[PDB]
Each structure stands twice: as C-alpha cells, then as structure tokens.
Nucleic acid binder design. Sequence first.
RNA 1: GGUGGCAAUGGCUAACCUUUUAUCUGGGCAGCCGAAGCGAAAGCAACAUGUGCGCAGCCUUUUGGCGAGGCACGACGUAUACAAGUGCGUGGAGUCACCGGGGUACGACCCGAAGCCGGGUGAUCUAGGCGUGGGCAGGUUGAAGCGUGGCGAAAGCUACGUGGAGGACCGUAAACGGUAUUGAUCUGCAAAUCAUUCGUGUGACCUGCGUCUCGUAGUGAAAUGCUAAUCUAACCCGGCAUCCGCUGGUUCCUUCCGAAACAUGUCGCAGCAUGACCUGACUUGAGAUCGUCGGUGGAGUAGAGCACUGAUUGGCGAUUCCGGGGAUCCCUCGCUCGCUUGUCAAACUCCAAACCCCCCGUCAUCCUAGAAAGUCGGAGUCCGGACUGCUGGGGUAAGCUUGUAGUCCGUAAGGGAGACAACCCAGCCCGUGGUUAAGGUCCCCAAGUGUCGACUAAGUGUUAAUACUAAAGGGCGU
RNA 2: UGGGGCCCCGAAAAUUGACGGGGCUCAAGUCGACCACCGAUACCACGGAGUACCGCAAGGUAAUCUCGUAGGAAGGCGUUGUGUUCGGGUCGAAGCAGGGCUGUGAAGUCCUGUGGACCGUUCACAAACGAAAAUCCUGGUAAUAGUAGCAGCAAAGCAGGGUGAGACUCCCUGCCGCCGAAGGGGCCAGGUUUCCUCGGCAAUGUUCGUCAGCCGAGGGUUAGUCGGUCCUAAGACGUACCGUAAUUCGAGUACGCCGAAAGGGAAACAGGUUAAUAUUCCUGUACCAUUUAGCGUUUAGUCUGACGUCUCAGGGCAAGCCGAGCGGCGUCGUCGCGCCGUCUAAGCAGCGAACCCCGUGGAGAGCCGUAAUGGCGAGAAGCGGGCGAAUCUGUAAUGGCACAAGUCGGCUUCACCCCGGGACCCGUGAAAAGGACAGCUAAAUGUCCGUACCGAGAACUGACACAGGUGCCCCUAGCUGAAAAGGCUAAGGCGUGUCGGAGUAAUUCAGUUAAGGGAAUUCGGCAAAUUAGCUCCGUAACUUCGGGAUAAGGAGUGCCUGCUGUGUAGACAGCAGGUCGCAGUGACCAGGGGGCUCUAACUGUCUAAUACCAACAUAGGAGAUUGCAAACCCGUAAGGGCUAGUACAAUCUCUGAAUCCUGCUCAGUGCAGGUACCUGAAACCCCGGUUCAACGGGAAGAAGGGCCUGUAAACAGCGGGGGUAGACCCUCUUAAGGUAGCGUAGUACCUUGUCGCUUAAUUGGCGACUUGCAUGAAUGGAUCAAUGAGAGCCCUACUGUCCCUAACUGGAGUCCGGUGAAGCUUACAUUCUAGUGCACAGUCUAGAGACCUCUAGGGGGAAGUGAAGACCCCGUGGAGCUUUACUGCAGCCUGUCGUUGGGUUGUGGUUCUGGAUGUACAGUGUAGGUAGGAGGCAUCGAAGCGGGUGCGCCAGCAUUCGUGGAGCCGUCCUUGGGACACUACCCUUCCGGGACUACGACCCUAACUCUGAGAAGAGGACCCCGAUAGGUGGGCAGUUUGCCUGGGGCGGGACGCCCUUGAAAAGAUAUCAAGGGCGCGCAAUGGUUGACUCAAGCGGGUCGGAAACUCGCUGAAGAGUGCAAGAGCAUAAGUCAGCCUGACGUUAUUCAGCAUAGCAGUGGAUGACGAGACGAAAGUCGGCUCUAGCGAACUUUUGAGCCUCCUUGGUGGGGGCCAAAAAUGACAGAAAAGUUACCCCGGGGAUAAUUGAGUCGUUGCCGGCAAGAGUACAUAUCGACCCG
Length: 238
Amino acid sequence: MGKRLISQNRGRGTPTYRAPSHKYKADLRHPRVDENSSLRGEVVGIEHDPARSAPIAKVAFENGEELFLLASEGIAVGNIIECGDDAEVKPGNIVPIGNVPEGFFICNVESKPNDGGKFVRSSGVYATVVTHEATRTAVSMPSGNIKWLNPKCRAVVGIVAGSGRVDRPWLKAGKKYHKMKTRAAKYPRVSAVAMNPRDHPFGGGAWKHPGKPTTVSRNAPPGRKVGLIAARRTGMKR
RNA sequence: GGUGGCAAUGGCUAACCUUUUAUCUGGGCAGCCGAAGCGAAAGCAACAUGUGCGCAGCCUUUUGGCGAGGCACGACGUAUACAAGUGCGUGGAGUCACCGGGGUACGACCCGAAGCCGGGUGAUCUAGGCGUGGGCAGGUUGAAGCGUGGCGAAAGCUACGUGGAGGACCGUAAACGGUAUUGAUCUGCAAAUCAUUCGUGUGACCUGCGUCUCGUAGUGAAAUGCUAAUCUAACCCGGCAUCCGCUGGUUCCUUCCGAAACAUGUCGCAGCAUGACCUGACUUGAGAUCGUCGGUGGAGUAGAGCACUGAUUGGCGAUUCCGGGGAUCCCUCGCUCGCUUGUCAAACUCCAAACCCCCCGUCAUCCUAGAAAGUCGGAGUCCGGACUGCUGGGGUAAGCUUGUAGUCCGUAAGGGAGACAACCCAGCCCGUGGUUAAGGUCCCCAAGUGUCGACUAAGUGUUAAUACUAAAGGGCGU
RNA sequence: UGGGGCCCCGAAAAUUGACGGGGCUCAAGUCGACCACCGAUACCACGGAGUACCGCAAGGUAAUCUCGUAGGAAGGCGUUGUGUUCGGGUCGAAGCAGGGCUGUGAAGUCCUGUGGACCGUUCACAAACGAAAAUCCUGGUAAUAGUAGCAGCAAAGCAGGGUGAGACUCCCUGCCGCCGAAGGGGCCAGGUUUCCUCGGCAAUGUUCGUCAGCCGAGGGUUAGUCGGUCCUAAGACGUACCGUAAUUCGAGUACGCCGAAAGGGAAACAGGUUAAUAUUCCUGUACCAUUUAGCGUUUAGUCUGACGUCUCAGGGCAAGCCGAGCGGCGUCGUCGCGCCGUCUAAGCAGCGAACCCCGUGGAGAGCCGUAAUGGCGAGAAGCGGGCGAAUCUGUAAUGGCACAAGUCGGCUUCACCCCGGGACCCGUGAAAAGGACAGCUAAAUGUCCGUACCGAGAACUGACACAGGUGCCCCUAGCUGAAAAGGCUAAGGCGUGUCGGAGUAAUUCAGUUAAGGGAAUUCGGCAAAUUAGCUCCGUAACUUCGGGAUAAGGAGUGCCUGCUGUGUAGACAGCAGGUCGCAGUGACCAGGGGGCUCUAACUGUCUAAUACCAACAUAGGAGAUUGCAAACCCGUAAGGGCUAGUACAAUCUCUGAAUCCUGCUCAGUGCAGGUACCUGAAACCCCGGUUCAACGGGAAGAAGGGCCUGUAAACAGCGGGGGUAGACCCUCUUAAGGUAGCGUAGUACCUUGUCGCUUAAUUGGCGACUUGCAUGAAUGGAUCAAUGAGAGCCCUACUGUCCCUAACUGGAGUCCGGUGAAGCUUACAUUCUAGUGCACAGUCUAGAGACCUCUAGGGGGAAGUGAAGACCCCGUGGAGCUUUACUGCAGCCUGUCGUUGGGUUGUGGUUCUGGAUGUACAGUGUAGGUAGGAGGCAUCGAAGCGGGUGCGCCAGCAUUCGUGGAGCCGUCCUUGGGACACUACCCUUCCGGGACUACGACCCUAACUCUGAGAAGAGGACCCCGAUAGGUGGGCAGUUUGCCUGGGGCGGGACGCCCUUGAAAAGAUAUCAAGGGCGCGCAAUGGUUGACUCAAGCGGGUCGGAAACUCGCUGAAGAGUGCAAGAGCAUAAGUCAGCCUGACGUUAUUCAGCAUAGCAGUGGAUGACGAGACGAAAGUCGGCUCUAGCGAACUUUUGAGCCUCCUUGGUGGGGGCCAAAAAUGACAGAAAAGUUACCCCGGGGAUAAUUGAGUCGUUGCCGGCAAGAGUACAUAUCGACCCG
Ligand SMILES: [Mg+2]
Ligand SMILES: [Mg+2]
Ligand SMILES: [Mg+2]
Ligand SMILES: [Mg+2]
Ligand SMILES: [Mg+2]
Ligand SMILES: [Mg+2]
Ligand SMILES: [Mg+2]
Ligand SMILES: [Mg+2]
Ligand SMILES: [Mg+2]
Ligand SMILES: [Mg+2]
Ligand SMILES: [Mg+2]
Ligand SMILES: [Mg+2]
Ligand SMILES: [Mg+2]
Ligand SMILES: [Mg+2]
Ligand SMILES: [Mg+2]
Ligand SMILES: [Mg+2]
Ligand SMILES: [Mg+2]
Ligand SMILES: [Mg+2]
Ligand SMILES: [Mg+2]
Ligand SMILES: [Mg+2]
Ligand SMILES: [Mg+2]
Ligand SMILES: [Mg+2]
Ligand SMILES: [Mg+2]
Ligand SMILES: [Mg+2]
Ligand SMILES: [Mg+2]
Ligand SMILES: [Mg+2]
C-alpha cells in the first residue's frame, strides 16, 4: 500500500487539517422568526470577523437577544433593521425574494425556507433577481448560473461588504502565511511530480514529468482522482 | 531379516471385568489377517496330482534304480463379448510376538537469516497542528506622510528640515545553524565531540511548559527524511523448534570385503529418481570363459589409387556446335570431347591391412569346500584429474576445451629421481638373517679418480619422460 | 662434389644464484661396448599373529590370503541404573598425582603419597551412555605488559608553622595566580538525604591521602499572609443514548468532571536566634477572609479581571557618580592621597502629572499647539471646578553599628514602575472564578500537603566525579570603548576543567619571525598573509529608477597650554599655539578589492551521524470540479473532516519574480458529450420439454463497448533521400513535418571542430561561425538589475604555497616515582637467494649467512589487524515499486426484488357479454361452427326492406323499431371450402373489455427524508438502506517472469523428430562440431495383372532452324521413383492400359526409442481370427521402395452394445466399460510481465572486473635470401615478396 494522499488525511480529521474553531467570533445566520412575525432592531457596533476577512454587524433585537449578522455594504451603527414578511425594500432589511423587484441586488440567500442563508456570502459578491413566476423565482448566482428558488425565501438586500479584497497582491510568502494560520488549509504545498511513487500517482522517475495523462475520469476510485477531475476541456483559449 | 509359540479342527484378541494398588491369574469371539479368484459392474466360480527331467538322501553289480522339495508341461476358473489368442488365478501355510534394518508423516541427528501473519506498546528523542508564557547587546540606511522656501504664466519642477517603514544592512562563543580546514581525536571528553574560519540574528524568527496526530498508519517547504542510538513498512510477545536442494558440526577399539565421479527422465544443471558399479543373506545344482591355437563369418579404418562423384597440371588431335574476338559469319577460337604428362579428397573407392566382434573345436584356468542363473535387505555415487597411444575434433597457441583404449591419483606405503598427487622399481601383518630391482659408484653420499676405441676446446656439456630443454641460415672449425 | 659426428656464429631483461652444490678438460663431458661392487618392506629362509575354507574333535590346506577413502558386515571395551549370584571397607571406600605389569587395542589390575565413607562382581536387561574441533556455550586464566592512558578546550603554585605512625596532595598566615554580563547570586524540572556533627580509610577518587558528594553512628525541614489548594484555555475522562456477532471497542448529543508550582489570583514587613530551619520560631508593628451577636441597607445593572507587533514624549525610582564635614584602615625613599562607613521595612495619614467631564468664553483675508501626527462656530485660545499615578512628606522610631561616627547637598538613571500619543494588518491579538458599587463594632475560627541540600566542567540525563545536552532560564560593580564586544580590576567563588619530578635527542600538536624572488607550488591561491575604527572629499558600467555603494580612490587622527559655539543640564561640536616618537583606531578590537561568464529571481527549507546545492518552497500565470441534502474524503455502522465555511469560496493539478512572447498536429492513449445503428447479464413474459422441475430456444434491452463530435497551459509528436546560385517544384508525406529564438551548450558522438582577445607557451575562459549523433516555446523559450558559505576564468595587493629551508616558544615524546588496561595468538621461529609446490614459502630442496641480551627510531615484509564482500554469479530465497503481465478484492455506475401507498389515463391479453355472428358456385336460408348429411317451429308469429338490427356481399336466417301479413325440412341440400331445421352458439367472434396483474408519463399525501425546542415548513413513494446481476477498477492483495551458455547479458535454440561425416574397419562415444531437413501433399501421385524400357549421343527426313515429331544404331542405368541425405530397384520398386479400394474390423509376441542395462506414447517386423481385390495358379496387397511428417492423466463430444443410481417397480436425468476427435513446439505435458545505484539474506574462486601463472594471434625489437633504387655500383644509404 503506497501511502494515502493528502485528501484522505483531511478525511480522517487529524489536527493538522482541522480548522482552529476557537478563533472564530460566531456563526452567521438569519434571525429565527415564527409565522406572521416581524421583529426589529438597531445596530450596536461594526466588528471584524476573522473567519471571512470581512466586517460583521452586532444587532440588539427588541426581545433582548443580540446576534452577529453578515454585514452588507453601507451598514452603519445606529440604523434599525426590520427583518420579517412586512419589511420594505431598503439596503439592510431582510425580506422574501418573492416580493423583491426585478433588478435589485440581494445576498445571503437561503436554499429552503428558514435555513439562515447559504449563498452569496464572501466579500463583495452579490446576486440578482431575474424573473418572478407564480411558483419560483430565478436569481443569477455570482458564479454565473440560474437558480430556481422558492418565493418564500429570505435574503438581505444589498451586496456583501469588503469588496475588492483581491486587488492587492500578496508579493510575499509571509503575508499569505499569516492568512493561513486562521484557516484549515495547509501552507505550503508540495507538488506531486516531486514526490516518490509511494506518495502520489505522479511521483517518481529520473526527471519530473507526470508520465500519465492528468485528466482523470469521474469514476476513478478514491486515492486516484488527482489532476483534472473529469474535465470537459483543457488549455487556454486560442 | 535372527529367534520363538500355535497351526486349516487356523492365529491373535481390543475396550472392559476379576486388580486384592498400576504388576499379576482367569475371562472377554466384537473384530482383524488366512482360507478363491476374475471383472468397471451385473455376475460367474478352478488340479486335494495327468506327464517328463532330476539335486539331496536311500538301495545297488559303483553302474544303474526309487526320488520329498525344484524346474518344465498338460488341464481348468474368469475378463477381453462374435471368434482366436493372451492377461490374471488354480494341486491347503498362515498368524501373533520379541530383538534388528529401512521407507513415509509429524520438530525428526544439532545449530545457522532476511522475511510473512495475529494481538498489544511508544510523539521524554524527532516531525507537524493548537493553548499559554519568555527572548533578541550595540550601531547603519532613511520609504510614505508633514513644515518652510526657490523656479513657473497654469499644469508642473525642485533644495533643506522633521518622520521612522522594511520576510532592509553590519554584528556578539545571547540564541539558532553547520560552509572550509577534507585540522585535533578516531579501543575518543563524546556509539558524532573539539578548535579556528563561517550563515541567520524584528521575523515564512528562536524557545519553556501543556495538549493532540502512529504502523500498509502518522508527520514531512519531499531526502524514502523522521516516528526513543532501529525505518523502501517501528518495537514487544505469539504462530515458531517456520522453511531451504545452501554453509559449519556429529564423541570407543579391532576384524572381513570395498566403489562411482557415468547413461536416460526431470522448470534439470550446487538437487532427485531408475540403471551400471559395492556389500549381506538365501534358493538351485554343473558347468563358465579373463587367455592361446585352427576354422566358418562381419568388415570399409590405415595405406594405396583414379574404376564412380567432385576437383587438378601442361603437350597433342578435334569438338566443324552450346561460345568471346571484329554480307560469304572473310578466319581468328576460350568452354568441351579423346591420347599422353603432374597433383588431390573428412562427407570419393576398382582395391585393401594390423587391432577388434559373434560362433565351433582344442589347450589352459576356475568349480560339488558350489559354475551359471534367480530372490530379498543396506548403501554410497551422477564437481573429477593426470600419463602413454589415436597425425583424435576445435582453436594462432595454451599447465586451453571436448572425445576415446589402457593404467593410475582420488583411496597407495616403501626405494630412486634436488624437492615432485598421478614418472621408474614395487602394491604393505610383526621380528631377525641373506640376495637383488630401479638407480648409481671424484667429495657432499654407500659403492670405480674402473677397462677398451674414438670425439669435443665451447665450462659446450655435466637435464629418461617431462606443462621445466631455442629456430631458419651459415662455417677454407675439426 | 655429395653424405655424416661434435662444436662455433645467429643468441638481449630486469634483487645476487643455480649442472642439486663443490668442481671437472687423453674428463668427473659425448658416442659404442664391457667388468666388479653398492642399493627396498621386492625375492629366499626361520619364528610369531590373524584370517578364509574343511574336519566330531585333535587338527589340516593357503605360489594361487594380509593396501585402502565413501560405504556394507562381524566381534569386543567403557559410563550410569534394574533383576539376580558371590563379596570388599575406619587394620581405611570413592576420587586425585605419579609409577610397575598385562592386552594388537578400546582398557584392566597392583604399588606409593593424599583422602575420611562408601564400592564392586556372575548371568541378563536398559539408556537423559564415550568429544579435539561447531567465527561452539558457561566459568577460570595467559601473552601483549609494568606497556597505552592519567597533555591539546581554563600551562599554578611557593615559603613558614601545625596535625599525624606516615604529608607535593589535609589545616592556618604571607606572597603569586584563575573566572569576573560567567566558573558569581535566585530557582524550575529532575535527584532523593547528597545537608550538619563525630569516628574511620579494605574498596570508590584516573597518583597519595590523616581528606572526601566514600564507609559507620547520631541529628536536622515548624506557615491564615510563601506556593499548591481555587478559576478556566487547548484538550482529556466518566454516566446515559445509539452502533458492533461482542467487548475493555466506535463518532456525535445531553449532563457532569478534570486540565497551568511561568495564564487570572484576599491578605506581612524589619531584626534576632541554630551546627544544620526560617517572609514559618522569637520581639515589635500590622493586615485579610468565613461564622455568631448587635446596629443599618442595595444602583442590580454596569465596570474591572481583560489582553497584539513596532515606535515615541513626560514623570518617578533601585543601581551608579561628584563635593563638604565626621570615624576607621592603608601608604609614608618624597608627597598627601586612596579605600570603607556615615543606615531604617511594611502599615497608617496627607498631596497629586497626563487623559477625561462640567460652567463660562466668543476665534478666520486666520489663530492655537506637538518630538511627531494635528484642533477649531457640530465652538479654538483663555478663565474656573470635578474624578484621577507611580513616587514623595510625616509617623512606625527604636532596631541594628567597633552605643565609632550616625550631618548634608548635587548629577545621572537603565534593563524597573506609572501615564499618554502615533503607525500597521486579505494577521484583529483568550476565557472564567474573583473584585467595586453598604457597610460599622465585638469575640471566636483559618483544616490539608511542600519546606533540608544540588540545580550542574562532581549532586540532573548520556553505563562514569563524561569537554555533550537540560539552564544562559532570570539577574549582575569600576576604567577603556557605540557597547552586556575584547582587555585590565572589585564583591563572590576557587588553585579539583584531581598525577608529580628532571630539563637532553629524533619526531609530533599549536604558535612567533624570516634575506632575494613573489603562485614559479597544486586538480584548484587549499592553507596563511594583506585590509580593518571614526571624520572629510570622491564615487563607474548597468538598472525593474528602488539600487549598485562601505563602489573604486585619496587626506586627517597622539600629548600639553588657552579657548569658542549649541543646550535647562548631562554632554556634544569646533578652533589657535607648543611638542615627542621609526610608528598616534600605537595594545585589544577591527572588510582585501576589481572584471567576464553559467545557474537559481529574492528572504526561507533539506538527507539528526560522509551530500546546505542548480534540489524543495515561494509570490506571479493558467487549467479543472462543485449552487451546499454540492465537489473531494474518513467509518463495518452509528456518524463525521473540510465547516462557526458558500464561487473575490473550498478542493485538485501544471508552471515558477519582472520584461519580450508562447507556433503547427485530435492519427495513438486519456477525458467529455451524443448513444441513428451493432453488441450487451439476471429477473419478468412467450414456446418446447418435464404426470412437477432441472434444461433448450425466442422476444425485449439497462450501464459499458463499437461508431460519431470536441478537447494540446490534457499525456504527447513536430520525418526521410536524391533534382536545382542549400534553396525550392516533387517526394518518403501510414495526423503534421519546427514559428520567434538559441546553438560545439550543465545538451555536440566525431572533438583538443575553425578563427579572434587573453599568455614565452593554454584539451582552459570569453567572442564569432554552426550541416543541431540527440535544441525549442507553461515536458515553458530567450534575456535579466539586486541577492549567493553555488560553479569556472582573468587583473591588482599580499604573502614560507614554493625556490630551500632555518632559528625560537608552550604541550606530548625521550629519562625517573605512583597507578594501571585492551585488541591479532595451532606450534616453533636469528634470516637471505633461487627452485619447487593449488602457478605469490621464515619452516620443503640446494646453497649463503648468523655469538646472546637490551634501549631508541621510522614503518619495508609477516599476501599485518579490524569484518562470514557492498563488485559479478547462483538460490524453482525475500522486500519495496511500476504496468495494456496472470488471478482476485474494495470503491463507483446501472437492471431486478423488498421497504411501498391512493388516483389520471395509453397499453395488451387476462377475463365477459348483444349474434353462430358461420355470407363468394348468393340465398326460397346466414355453412343456426362442426353436426345422428337431417324434420321441429309458423296470424296458436313467419318473409323479402329501411340510416340498413347482431353482422355481412345496404342480400337476409331473427321477429327486433317496423314492413308486408310465411321463412317451413331439404329425400328441390344455393346437391356444399363449410349445405345449412328448434332443448343449444361447448367453440370464426363480439370484444363497456369492466376485471388482479406488468409497462411509459402525470397528480395526491398518510408512510419515509431534511430543517426547527416545538407549531410548522420543504421534498415524497423518488432517495437512502438490505439482497442479487452486469460493467469499470494497479485504489489494494497474493503470485509468476524457465533453461542452455568457454562468467552473466545480447545473439541464437545444438529445447521434439529424420539422414551423412566427426567416430579411431563389432557395438558405444562430447562440444553454441560440419552438411542439412521436417511439423506436409495425393481417389490417385494407392492395390493387382498384362505389355514394354529409360538418360545421352550418332545417321536421315519439309523454314518442324543449331528449339519440336518420327525411323535405325550404341546404351547395367549415366533416367524415374511427391519433398532433405543416404541406401534399393531392369522381363523391375520405373512407363502405359484393364479391373479394383488391403488408405479393412479384432488380437499376440519380439526389436528400437532406451548397445551392454531400468524408463510412456508409439512405430516396425513377424504372426492369428473374420471378410475381400487382382490373377490360370503361385502369389501380392495392413497406403504412396526403406529410414521424418507428431503428444500422458483429468475433461467434453461422437459410435456399437451392455452394467448401474442406496426397501421395491416405472418415467426424466446422471455414473461406468471399449474405441475416435479436440493440446500441452519449454514437444516425458505450471492457467503467468518488469525494475532496484534505496535494496536485504544464504553461499560461490563450483563463475566474472584485475594482481599473479600459461600462450603470443596482435604489439615492440631483430635475422635469412637479396628483387630494385642509389648518374655506372644490391650491400655509403634505403629495402620489396617470401621465410625464421
Ligand atoms: Mg501508485
Ligand atoms: Mg462384439
Ligand atoms: Mg533625514
Ligand atoms: Mg548578520
Ligand atoms: Mg518470533
Ligand atoms: Mg588416407
Ligand atoms: Mg548426491
Ligand atoms: Mg601411468
Ligand atoms: Mg589405486
Ligand atoms: Mg613415494
Ligand atoms: Mg569406512
Ligand atoms: Mg573440551
Ligand atoms: Mg580577568
Ligand atoms: Mg587510591
Ligand atoms: Mg482544578
Ligand atoms: Mg608529565
Ligand atoms: Mg536560491
Ligand atoms: Mg523547483
Ligand atoms: Mg504550446
Ligand atoms: Mg590554471
Ligand atoms: Mg534451479
Ligand atoms: Mg502488485
Ligand atoms: Mg505464500
Ligand atoms: Mg543461467
Ligand atoms: Mg531516490
Ligand atoms: Mg551477502
């Protein structure tokens, strides 16, 4: 048995591949609201979240419990939020996507109703509402695809803050090193062709070349799906 | 196999009971072998002596007769399914022990690896992640930003001051590392240290304590590195007394006999099986041939020769061709056919030995104190080598390689060769006397400064064979 | 002139030397003869032992008996014990040491010395039964040897006086020394009594020892305030729930509980006391909690605990320094200086700098500030008040001091405390207990554990009193100086980094200096030297504009006298004059510099113990998957990682900064999509079969495959030649045929390629050309500033690297005292030369030398020692790794069955009605299936017609809605495809097809799934799950990968069969020996009878040409006989004709394969039984004249007939006997690919590199004959061919 790969080591969950959970501030989710309820609340502070490298907002609600929230751009300390079914459309509120007009930008969209939000969450991303049929609504995801969501889904209006995070090049191994200390990723990563034939399917030889084609089928067993997994095309555009 | 009990009306009991302490006495007929074989099976089912040769033994006129066991026939059972031939079987000897040998399975005469698998131990070292603390003498450069001021018509250009950035610079024997001396030491201070010279030294930094990740698994800025002096799969115990055709060892005396290093088969070539060769016992009972001479037969090697098959040298006469030279093919004329000259043959032979082989007769040797033949037990051996012949085959040759006949070393003393595995004499129980073999006789060294007739003038030579000893050519040297 | 004997020339090898040596000349040589003697265990004689065979024994015979390894056989000796017979011993058993006798021997017995209690023997039987060897095991003990070591990084001791049996080593004083930012002080972990006193010195201490961390006896650790205890971090553990065949096993969830002697934290200081304990005991002065009692009260929600890296201002203070007075000590040749001291805790009371808050204030064509950033009508400056620090002042103030002084000022201040500002982050830099806000007074309580000493060049760890490591973890005075560097000294600790004396060789470790030359040394400037601080001047090519840069290259520097400037000060900067030395950073410390190339962008990482690099990483570039109940992965499952995440994300790959760029190919392999068509398992369905099944076919058809399309920043590829100033038309184009670039390269074999610069001279360095064995574009191309313990070459300075060595210094060595090992060893040994020998001898053979012992010295030899070779081969030995090797297993994709329900309809029969619907040659009738080949119905209901009523031929049986008011049977059969009549329609059919079923699609919710505490929401009979069938599948596992071989490999097959030679005149006989062939063909190319003679020549005939057919002659074979070679054949074994199929079924021996002499199957020669062909008959025929053309067991199939399946009989289906076919060519018969330089083990000189030995083809050097050239002349000179 030539040694397992890095992906299977991540599978086991050894301490080298586990996220340092105790650093993260808090989990981000929408307020839990019963049927036919509408709770409000005004921002108390704007705070930095080390799990995403973007700001988050602290909001104190009328019942008493405060929650961190995914901060859309423009959110300022003092503004009140009106999450609920009867909310109007403004930058900051949380409203169903069924009664959001076409052309408006949204973020922190849910998959099924009352999930808290799963799509459109990294820095500066956003999605759009395209069409409103009776049973579904099509939103263009930041990847570039059309998704058909339930009309009774919740999403904050605006775009996620922190836009432009990747216009600043690293230009050092040290800065990227410092980012990786608060993530589960491993840094730095050895290249496969420089290993031994025990360690990887590509290792070995008197000179460093893959030897076999890099594209691998989708049916390859675990421990072999390394390279271009089931690629449809390769190369740049000529 | 040696020795015993019982014996076709066969031999022996097993577990167990009687045990009265393991003994022992008497029971125990279940069962096993023998008594009928043949055939896949269904099935079928034989001589309780018909003939001859004849050993031992007995009788006898010492020649013959009877003649158990032995051998050779004849007859019969069954299978081959049609027949005919043949196979196996048939005229009653087995069974149970004790003392031995051998085969097979088990640790299997004793020791000798790397490995494979099961369950457990380890992150005090080291590798990486996380928690919480500590550390980095002293200097250098001078980014952005800010103030004042010059050149300008706007845009703009520019000097000085302040400021203190950077995986920046220099540098401690603080700390971490480990270039070169290929220095010191190399049974050391040390199972990796020391001296000088060196690299980083505000960061992808060094580090204390705590905590987590581990064996087909972990960790790795990736060398197959590290995981407790162990890592191309750790360590402890168990399977395990693993296994090997491969290496080492295997303990007292004498006596009789005494090999093979070869053929065939083999995933066979460092192994094994069967045969040849050695040894022990038994059965049978009269011939055998290691040798000589004569004869009936087999030769196709040496030598020799051209009569066949292939080559081969000139002269002569013609092929009026099949042919090359320069319009009557003007005419030259090689290949070819005959007579004569000069050479050949391992796959040529009109011829043809000496050795050698089968058989008959004779002599000679062995033999009833057991020829030839047969049956059973135990093996070793299948790495060989050398000398004299075969102009042996191959090769330039070889103390080369591969054959063959004889004899040797292996396993062979003693005598002689300077020493000499296998060259000459000799095949050897112990002691004494005697004469010889090989070889020698100036001294070393036992016995000849021996005899007869010549040669050599070079210290040539003073060297049976021999893996140890020089050639062609020349000499008015003798 | 020829033929002979001996000798001479031809004739050269390496340590000195081989007739065996001395020597030998009418011989001590050679040739031909001869005589005498010596000389074995041979041969003769005598005596003796054993053996073989015979004999009843006595004994007899042996010229025809006496060697021996592997090995076979026979008889005996010994050790311990059992059964049995007979004994010995305190008047001395066993055992041990040495002797006498017996036996061929194993061995027995006796004697003497020792010893002090047990030991034998006859006949038999047993075994934990006999040792010289195993790099054997355990114990004891040699030589080496009184030897190495007791030096290298810290060279330390001397005098006087004691103690004591004994003094270099133990104690006191004086001098002389070592560390002094560690060798001093404080303490973690660790140790565990090492701590103190007394008494000892056998061992321990690298020597001695009266000493001791050693040995013996005794003694020593005191806490409300110092720690633990308490809180929580990473992260563990327990109980429950669930999983697992099961647990002591497994993730998650709930509830608990632990985890820091360096994180948070309620509270104590000074002095004294002991031999060893002290914020712990004692004196004094304090402080903090919990409970009880009394006297009152919340604000109860906030603050604090509570937080990163860098940088800076302000304040304070321990340490430090200076001046004056006072008290001691030192020096005193002269002077009057130098050092020590001049002290004082917590607690309590008081004060408060910055920031911040409040009341006034009214500032702009601008004012107020900071080291700096800055502030301002959203209210500056200024003026008031409030909250608010370290530290400071008083008291505590009487304790300690030689009760000796004990008084004052000043400067500075880190590395410590307080307070505030700024910058940076694709880094954001802990939590909880506790505390504050309502407490005051009084008494009582404050349990438990640790406390000695070390904390390291002697108390820990590495086996040690170990030059390593843990701990340099935290602290440290004066001068020089930037400094905690280096040097010199305090306090403190030591003369123990535990051997001394003596002073004299070589050699050795580490240093100092060196004339003249200056890399000439060497693979290579390795090693060593040069330079070196600070100030000023000056500074190149190139460049990513940041740099290069301390570039390069120059000048100054001491001491004394007097000053100036900045500053609150500490201090810093500058000047003028004088002056000394060879030298002024005077010692310590402290860069040599420059130029041209290759390579990697840079800082970083790496084989702990031979590799610090060009390798790895990196920022930058590109590609791929995935919309989250996702992609990727772990688990048997329960459940999880990524993930407190969401496409500016995670995961998976290639390339490797910047700059200029990145061409052509989709044939191969891989990947993705399409699946028109072909192939494609099981279940269900249909047919046949089976009294039921097994079983055989058909239909249908999932995934996958074929086929098609796309894809190269997917793995990869980018070719020949010959025409043409090496072009370009053609090619060879099995997809295309190298674009920019670079080019003798880190790639170029030829090769030291050609030319230029660099040297007197260059297999070099650089530049240019370049036909590139075998360059080339993210298998990245080219170039590149800065960086480099990277790799080459050149210049300058410098030097003992060198010419060529010399003197000196310290440590060893040499000599003396003490202590005190280890490793090679069969034995002997004073050697040298040659030979011989397993061909590399101190021991053998022949010579030559050598009196013995000891010391020093370097290493010639002992194929010196260390070690079961790492190189090569072998083993039906291993391991890891790779793949389109052989066989499998996980993972994934898909069909079917279960979980699994209710409807919408399209499917098909299943199943059910209205008519026998049934009807062509029609019909009066509709074949009321078929059919008793026909006899009952009918105004008591039967007809012709309608759109037409079952239906069909708009006919007509039924009586239906009628319509006329007869269709009757048919023996008028519409004389029939079927000819027809009611109680029969049992059945072409009709087919609401309702009905259970299986398919394709759609809908619903109640199962089920996800989310939520739950209401509920979202999906939904799908998915997950259990089982089964097919695919893909080096992800993983178990194995195989042969042998021969002038080593293995490569080549080949001498790996099965047949012929000739080798092969030596019977038979046998090897090599990778020579010549070769076969793995077939034929219904005639076979059998038999009959008739004939073939090849080649000569003579004749018409173009029938020297190429045809025919006639005559010669013709033993010169032809033919299927195929190699050899053999055979003439009234034939050849050619042709006639008739035929013996190219037959069954069966026994013998021969060779495989001499002699075992071994399949299988073939070839004789026969036997049964049938034939040809021929008058004899006879011939078991294929093709003879010798090649082929394969076991097991398994399947086929042929004839039988035997058989478990209590009996039958059916279907199996099993068996005999023969034929299907193949194992590695051919006496495995289902079978590579690599290892990361390798491991067991053996081999049974087998290779090269040291040796043998040979000499080749190589080096000569000779013989002389052909010829040399103007004539072979030989002044050169020398052919051939020969040695
Ligand atoms: Mg692999
Ligand atoms: Mg028959
Ligand atoms: Mg400046
Ligand atoms: Mg440095
Ligand atoms: Mg074991
Ligand atoms: Mg001859
Ligand atoms: Mg053998
Ligand atoms: Mg001989
Ligand atoms: Mg012999
Ligand atoms: Mg001899
Ligand atoms: Mg023997
Ligand atoms: Mg012994
Ligand atoms: Mg000092
Ligand atoms: Mg001592
Ligand atoms: Mg605790
Ligand atoms: Mg000394
Ligand atoms: Mg680098
Ligand atoms: Mg790389
Ligand atoms: Mg390309
Ligand atoms: Mg050079
Ligand atoms: Mg073998
Ligand atoms: Mg494998
Ligand atoms: Mg196995
Ligand atoms: Mg071989
Ligand atoms: Mg490697
Ligand atoms: Mg080995």
